[PDB]
Design a protein around this ligand. Structure first.
Ligand SMILES: [Mg+2]
Ligand SMILES: [Mg+2]
Ligand SMILES: [Zn+2]
Lengths: 293, 203, 175, 128
RNA sequence: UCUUUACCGACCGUUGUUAUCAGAAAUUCACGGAGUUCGGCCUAGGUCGGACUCCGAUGGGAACGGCAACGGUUGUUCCGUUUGACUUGUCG
RNA sequence: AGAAGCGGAUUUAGCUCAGUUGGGAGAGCGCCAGACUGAAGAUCUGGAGGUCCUGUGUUCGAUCCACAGAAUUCGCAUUU
């Protein structure tokens, strides 16, 4: 199973309206990621820290998984997650994080300065830390801080699609990624494709070679997409749908229903999951002694 | 004799759950001596030939209506589950389930690190700190079942009063909450590293 | 300054239904015979009070009689006054409870009249337990007990969930 | 004397706690009665456990109960007294109720009648 | 929290705290009932005082119990080093 | 991106920070709303907004007390 968790959405501000051409372009690149092969896609959305945020509930989501991606799902056979990368620069203006967190599934950050990077790892409940690979790194990471942040949770994220943008950006990208691998101790490394087009897509065996040539080993790369990628999905998925990893509204069937794998069988209206009477206390004993299922 | 047992309720509970397991092992031995596979004939066989052994045996047929109806009606009253379902509120319901006690619940091991623990349904007689106690029937087995919580996924059905139209199913994880009910009355559950949950993605 | 605060306190949700004293009606047809019989007992001799009619009027003897010492007399009848002042509530919350676990056919009758302070002020305490084995009195006691004075338990008989009851008490707080 | 304010907005957390306490009390009482009607004392250390946990939850959220509940349950081992050992009266004191464990709960009854508890008085209490 | 071959055991003292309500009482204040013993008036044994023991609905609660701080230990407190080798300078 | 080892200080709303017999969870700024103005700022009023770093245990009850696991950050005759 493969997870691509940083596909960007063609919108930066809530005042802007997405045209149908960008939506059709996203449909074509999802068909591209379905063509060669992938398992999970979590599309990303950029949010600045000092914007004028709407005080709404059902309007914080310009993603619409149900109406357009629910139609794409039946011909696709995959699933989409929605997430926010918090572009936090200065401790001047903030937000109500309990609404923005519980709106989508995964919560991320994007630091620019010193103190924001500390208060993100310290107090802010997020899932992944993304740095600006296109521009200059804010500070150079200390080992005992990043190690304690991985031991607390949140892992670092590398966007190999940002090197495919320009020529000059590749040097700054590799200079950031080698520092991330150096100061992260090769524990919290989750990789993702920041492509805006189907013309910049790659295969697993080329991304593995990219991670080889950057400095991280091969088995640890595939383990990062098998173990480390799908667990930080489950972290935010249990945090924002259910309680703080305590009691879940996700049905535990044999091999088809899961919190991660069965998204459509869960009513995404509030919490619930409508499941038929599969548990009878009257005449059901041990699992190996049953005869009706 | 009777006074020395019930001086501490925990030690007497431990003595009772040990006595139930010993009586179940003796019941299996007397059942293999009986050579009758039917349990309804086996209970009458024990009533005829072993009076003192029959006294500490559980009664699951009695245990189901005395627990399931009270548990379902308590959840239908507590979580405000009525005929009107379109006014539901899920977050406060999950907070109430975080505040409600699971003593007396029907619960099913759906996923576990051990492949043999899954498929077990049972009704809570007592909640431990890090283990779990249920009771399940087999062909002739009536053993008190202890199941670890570190690395297991549990699920329970909340039925609705309509017949075969709609019902709810919720899931808890015993590796997440690992405390007594007394602390769970006051505890506000917080975030964890959740790194050891790979089994839930694995199986 | 004093301020009044209402504090929520959990009630016993079934103590009202556990103390649903039985339905009694057309009761002045009974106190005439009962009071005349009790007075005719209490006139002559203290030995002749309990020698033709065996009755116990001390609660310790009521507990020792219903413990299981005497199992021969199965129909045993009890008369207890409620709605009456100067009656202790500690015994009265435990009298209909202890007769339920008794294996003998114990027939509690709740006397509903508030003005009936005579039987408490005269005999011992206001309660009467006696036996209808071969006495003449049963020849009318079996007549009316099926009519209105039936005593049955609905609360423990069937399986039923009980709704919670949370009341609230007054508290005067000085600051 | 002061200000008279009667609020009927009950709080949701207190309703959750008292529903939890009442559910534990009901399941312990029904286990005890279902065991006591049929046969001998099989799982009498079980239901007591619930009451003990109930009392510990009564220690957590600073909650108080009616004296009917605390009169029903014990004080040391915290068991239900629906089937007690012995009841004695006028044995040179007031009253005595013996239990199986040996802890007694006596009441001053030989002093005077017409004494009610603070929750049983005429106007001090409002239901629901 | 404690004890260690204890052929006898030994939870140190003081101060403050356990908020509101409840209850007679939140620290062996006091108050109410029962029993015993002693003394005075007095002698069908009535009453009064002192001492002990037991019980009294409430609350986690009456348990010299829990928490925090301080010491009588062989008087307390303060001050100084017992720590260097090469190079340079002064003095004999 | 200038380690290593040592002492001190410290983590509470988006931010900067109080605060604590141990029994209520806050102030300023910011956001929204009211008031006000032709409009706006300022002033003023109200509401929304909490993982009191996390965990154990003590207690009847933890921002507070004890322990454990993280760390934040200063200083080392410095402005690299
Ligand atoms: Mg080192
Ligand atoms: Mg070191
Ligand atoms: Zn007891």
């Amino acid at each position: 199973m493969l997870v691509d968790l940083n596909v960007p959405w063609p919108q930066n501000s809530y005042a802007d309206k997405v045209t149908s051409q960008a939506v059709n372009n996203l449909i074509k690149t999802l068909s591209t990621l379905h063509m060669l092969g992938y398992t999970h896609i979590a599309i990303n959305f950029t949010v600045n820290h000092s914007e004028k945020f709407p005080n709404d509930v059902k309007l914080l989501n310009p993603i619409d998984i149900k109406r357009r991606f629910g139609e794409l799902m039946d011909r696709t056979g995959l699933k989409l997650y929605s997430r926010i990368t918090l572009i936090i620069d200065d401790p001047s203006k903030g937000q109500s994080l309990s609404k923005i967190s519980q709106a989508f599934d995964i919560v991320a950050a994007l630091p620019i300065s010193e103190k924001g990077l500390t208060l993100s790892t310290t107090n802010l409940d997020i899932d992944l830390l993304t740095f600006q690979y296109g521009s200059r790194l804010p500070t150079f990471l200390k080992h005992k801080s990043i190690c304690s942040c991985v031991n607390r949770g949140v892992k670092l994220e590398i966007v190999y699609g940002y090197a495919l943008r320009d020529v000059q950006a590749r040097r700054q990208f590799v200079s950031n990624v080698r520092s991330v691998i150096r100061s992260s101790r090769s524990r919290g490394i989750v990789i993702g494709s920041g492509a805006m087009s189907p013309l910049e897509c790659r295969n697993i065996l080329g991304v593995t070679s990219l991670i080889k040539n950057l400095g991280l080993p091969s088995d640890r790369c595939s383990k990062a997409m098998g173990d480390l990628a799908s667990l930080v999905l489950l972290n935010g998925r249990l945090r924002n749908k259910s309680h703080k990893q305590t009691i879940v509204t996700g049905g535990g069937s044999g091999n088809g229903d899961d919190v991660v794998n069965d998204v459509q069988g869960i009513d995404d209206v509030q919490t619930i999951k409508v499941v038929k009477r599969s548990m009878d206390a009257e005449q059901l004993g041990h699992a190996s002694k049953r005869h009706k299922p | 004799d009777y006074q020395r047992i019930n001086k501490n309720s925990k030690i007497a509970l431990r003595e009772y759950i040990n006595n139930c397991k010993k009586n179940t092992k003796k019941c299996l031995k007397l059942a293999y001596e009986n050579k009758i596979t039917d349990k309804e004939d086996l209970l009458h066989y024990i009533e005829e030939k072993h009076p003192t052994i029959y006294e500490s045996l559980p009664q699951y047929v009695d245990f189901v209506p005395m627990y399931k109806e009270l548990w379902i009606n308590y959840i239908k009253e507590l979580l405000n589950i009525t005929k009107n379902l379109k006014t539901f509120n899920g977050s406060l319901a999950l907070l109430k389930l975080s505040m409600a006690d699971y003593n007396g619940a029907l619960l099913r091991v759906t996923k576990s690190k051990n492949k043999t623990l899954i498929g077990l349904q049972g009704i809570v007689i007592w909640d431990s700190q890090k283990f779990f106690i249920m009771i399940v029937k087999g062909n002739i087995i009536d053993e008190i079942k202890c199941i670890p919580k570190k690395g297991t996924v549990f699920q329970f059905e909340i039925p609705i009063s309509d017949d075969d139209d709609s019902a709810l199913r919720y899931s808890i994880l015993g590796d997440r909450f690992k405390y007594r009910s007394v602390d769970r009355a006051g505890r506000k559950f917080k975030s964890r590293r959740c790194d050891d949950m790979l089994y839930y993605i694995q199986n | 300054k004093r301020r009044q605060v209402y504090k929520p306190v959990l009630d016993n949700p079934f103590t009202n239904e556990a103390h649903m004293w039985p339905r009694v009606h057309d009761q002045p047809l009974i106190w005439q015979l009962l009071q005349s019989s009790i007075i005719n007992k209490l006139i002559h001799i203290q030995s002749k009070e309990n020698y033709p009619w065996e009755l116990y009027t001390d609660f310790n003897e009521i507990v020792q009689y219903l413990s299981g010492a005497h199992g021969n007399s199965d129909p045993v009848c009890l008369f207890v006054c409620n709605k009456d002042p100067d009656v202790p509530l500690v015994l009265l919350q435990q009298i209909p409870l202890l007769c339920y676990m008794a294996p003998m056919t114990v027939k509690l009758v709740q006397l509903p009249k508030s003005a009936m302070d005579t039987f408490k002020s005269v005999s011992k305490y206001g309660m009467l337990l006696l036996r209808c084995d071969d006495r003449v009195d049963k020849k009318f006691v079996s007549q009316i007990q099926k009519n209105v004075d039936l005593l049955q338990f609905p609360w423990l008989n069937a399986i039923k969930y009980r709704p919670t009851s949370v009341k609230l008490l007054k508290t005067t707080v000085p600051i | 004397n002061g200000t008279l304010l009667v609020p009927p907005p009950r709080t949701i957390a207190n309703q959750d706690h008292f529903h939890r306490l009442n559910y534990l009390y009901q399941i312990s009482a029904y286990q005890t009665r279902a065991r006591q009607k049929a046969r001998t004392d099989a799982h009498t250390p079980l239901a007591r456990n619930y009451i003990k946990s109930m009392d510990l939850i009564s220690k957590k959220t600073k909650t108080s109960l009616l004296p009917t509940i605390k009169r029903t349950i014990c004080k040391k081992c915290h068991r239900l007294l629906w089937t007690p050992k012995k009841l004695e009266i006028t044995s040179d004191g007031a009253l005595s109720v013996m239990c199986g464990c040996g802890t007694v709960k006596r009441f001053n009854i030989g002093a005077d009648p017409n004494y009610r508890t603070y929750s049983e008085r005429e106007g001090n209490l409002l239901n629901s």
